[PDB]
Design a protein around this ligand. Sequence first.
Ligand SMILES: Nc1ncnc2c1ncn2[C@@H]1O[C@H](COP(=O)(O)OP(=O)(O)O)[C@@H](O)[C@H]1O
Length: 392
Amino acid sequence: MSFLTLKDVDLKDKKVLVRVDFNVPVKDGKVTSKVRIEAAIPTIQYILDQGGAVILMSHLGRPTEGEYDSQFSLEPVAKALSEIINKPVKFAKDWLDGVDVKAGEIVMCENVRFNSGEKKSTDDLSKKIASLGDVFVMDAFATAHRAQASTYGVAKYIPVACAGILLTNEIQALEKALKSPKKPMAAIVGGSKVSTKLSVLNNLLDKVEILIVGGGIANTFIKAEGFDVGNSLYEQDLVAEATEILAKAKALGVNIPVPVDVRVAKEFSENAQAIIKKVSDVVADEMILDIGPESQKIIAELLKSANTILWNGPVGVFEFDNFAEGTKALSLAIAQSHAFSVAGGGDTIAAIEKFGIKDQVSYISTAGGAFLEFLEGKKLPAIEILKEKAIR
Ligand SMILES: Nc1ncnc2c1ncn2[C@@H]1O[C@H](COP(=O)(O)OP(=O)(O)O)[C@@H](O)[C@H]1O
């Protein structure tokens, strides 16, 4: 609401520049997944119906700035879009000098990342991009955490800057979980290290009633509670930090359900056999690879009560069937909850696909760092410039 959306701007007979996420996997000049191209169809369709000309801008892969590289050209993506849309898509390689388009037509620019000044958002390149159209639309959330000429700089100099369909929905789903969640609110933070999720843990610790820690993160908390972890993956350096997190959670009346029991193994492979053990019975030679059935029950209880769920990780190495029970019971609890659920991160997405509960999750973010920076409570430069340019 703080920024303008597609419905708040005049798109009739205007050159409309759209920053999309067409960072799709390519193999031998052919797209192996069309998911992200299918996602931006409503945004493209809407502009076309309003009477404007669409100018698509995107990044692909990791090319070196200031150089052209055919293995990262958006040419196969332009052909892929024309197939899905059924509408002709002109591919512009000389788009910076000029772009020629007529209402009802779609034009695909060559990869932005080739241009000098893109990563640093140079005012030189930002003004050149802004001069190509009348309105700027930002539809690529996965890149909203980076200030770049085609995600941030163009919005400074273009006459009109707004947010597209995908970006408006992503910010709305995330803000419905973070800014003012219907209580109770439960967050699940799982991963290999407390260090990589510390900022997520400190930001959520203030906004939730339930904070479930999982995997390597949970193991560090098990060590903080005084229990022996043996050969389990944990960060010794952060034990003092996780000890403080448990103290602040106590003071703020947050339920951090540290596992009461675990599933331990003597080998890290898909052939190892689970041994259900109380947290206090972990031997030196053993490693915690999943939670126990008592810890699953505690989690299922707490998520049944919740009206908002924020899921960022598993509770076990679910890639191993013998250590998948914990993440299965967690996924099934989230599915049964009917709470507004927001999921993000690769393991969470793999857990959702493996346990086939994708429909039963209200929102699934496919963003990486952009999703994590938002969960950390940080300002996303692409979003902030749209807020400024929305003021009248
Ligand atoms: N008990 C555990 N011990 C070791 N590794 C685990 C355990 N539980 C889960 N993992 C694995 O650790 C990885 C989590 O790392 P991370 O990349 O931070 O997760 P994400 O970024 O998707 O939230 C996952 O691959 C997960 O399967």
